[PDB]
């Protein structure tokens, strides 16, 4: 009944090599360790995803190109543009080994849930939800979330994917757009010009998977209370209609106040309440990270959320550790929202919610 914590020193070093989030994995782990939370969890060393395992979602053409430019570090390949490699997703040396490590880590967590070893499995270095079957996107080279869901499908008939990242979980949604075995729910910023540009409330999936995709478009400046009440109402309707047997939860911390993207205005407490509501279901739950570009804040958030999973109240004061100096000037766990308005009109929020309720009536 103790939650599983996917970790190994080699795995963290690997994830630290991401150009878009250097050293973030170490900061997250070190803070968790500093709070001694790892002693309350079962530490499981992740295995590397094999080519075949990765091929359960990604095409062989993409995987082979990815591996090819990875060994070379060739950032000037004429095929890379169509495969989504570029500014957002550079051809870093060893990028294939990196992506294979993250994919395997999420698969390992999923396998732990299948084997009944735990009810909660955690991979904070995962949650790369933008990657498509044949295209890298939004700092995501391999979609470990999809890989994890496909693994869970071996044991669980219906899987609910919840995406609380700042950005639309388009890669995961696209992967299961035509199926009713997996329902995707994404709460995200939706505004013209904002990546990835998709995920309106009118997007509900296709074919047999119609109405099995849920999108909650949100505007800038949303804070804990409005977000949670909006999240709870949606999740309540979703749970009733879909009746999931397993949950995959993406918890990208780029929604948190202090993030350089400066869009949402959340604190880890608000996200924590959404987490608590999901954990209340007592289902097999796979926890993933994702976005988060204020590194210290992301560590603050995921450490706090780890405490939520463990049902522990963490000390407000950041304990001394390797990256202690990065937590100035206040050196506390709590995060203060910024003093900017919430661009979300209450009538529009209720309007979106009613639209979703209308869609979920078709889910039987």
């Amino acid at each position: 009944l103790v939650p599983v914590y996917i970790y190994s020193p080699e795995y963290v070093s690997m994830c630290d090599s991401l150009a878009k989030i250097p050293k973030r994995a170490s900061m997250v782990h070190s803070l968790i360790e500093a709070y001694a939370l790892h002693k309350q969890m079962r530490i499981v060393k992740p295995k590397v995803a094999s080519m075949e395992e990765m091929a359960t979602f990604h095409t062989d053409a993409y995987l082979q190109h990815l591996q090819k430019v990875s060994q070379e570090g060739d950032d000037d390949h004429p095929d890379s543009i169509e495969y989504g490699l570029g500014y957002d997703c550079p051809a870093t040396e060893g990028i294939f080994d990196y992506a294979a490590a993250i994919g395997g880590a999420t698969i390992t967590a999923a396998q732990c849930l299948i084997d009944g070893m735990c009810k909660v499995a955690i991979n904070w270095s995962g949650g790369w939800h933008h990657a498509k079957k044949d295209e890298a996107s939004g700092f995501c080279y391999l979609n470990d979330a999809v890989l994890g869901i496909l693994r869970l499908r071996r044991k669980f008939e219906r899987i609910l994917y919840v995406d609380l990242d700042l950005h639309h979980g388009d890669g995961v949604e696209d992967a299961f757009s035509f199926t009713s075995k997996v329902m995707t729910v994404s709460l995200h910023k939706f505004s013209p010009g904002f990546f990835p540009g998709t995920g309106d409330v009118s997007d509900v999936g296709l074919g047999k998977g119609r109405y099995y995709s849920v999108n909650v478009p949100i505007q800038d400046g949303i804070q804990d209370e409005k977000y949670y009440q909006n999240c709870e109402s949606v999740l309540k309707e979703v749970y009733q209609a879909f009746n999931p047997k397993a949950v995959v939860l993406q918890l990208g911390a780029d929604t948190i106040a202090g993030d350089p993207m400066c869009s949402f205005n959340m604190t880890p407490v608000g996200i924590g309440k959404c987490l608590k509501y999901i954990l209340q279901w007592q289902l097999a739950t796979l926890i993933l990270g994702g976005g988060g570009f204020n590194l210290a804040n992301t560590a603050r958030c995921w450490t706090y959320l780890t405490g939520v999973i463990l049902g522990k109240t963490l000390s407000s004061e950041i304990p001394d550790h390797e990256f202690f100096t990065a937590y100035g000037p206040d050196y506390v766990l709590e995060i203060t929202p910024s003093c900017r308005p919430d661009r979300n009109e209450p009538h529009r929020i209720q309007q979106i919610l009613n639209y979703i309720k209308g869609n979920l009536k078709h889910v039987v």
């Binding site: 700092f139 990546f195 540009g197």
Partner: peptide
């Protein structure tokens, strides 16, 4: 295609 958007930039992230």
């Amino acid at each position: 295609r958007h930039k992230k």
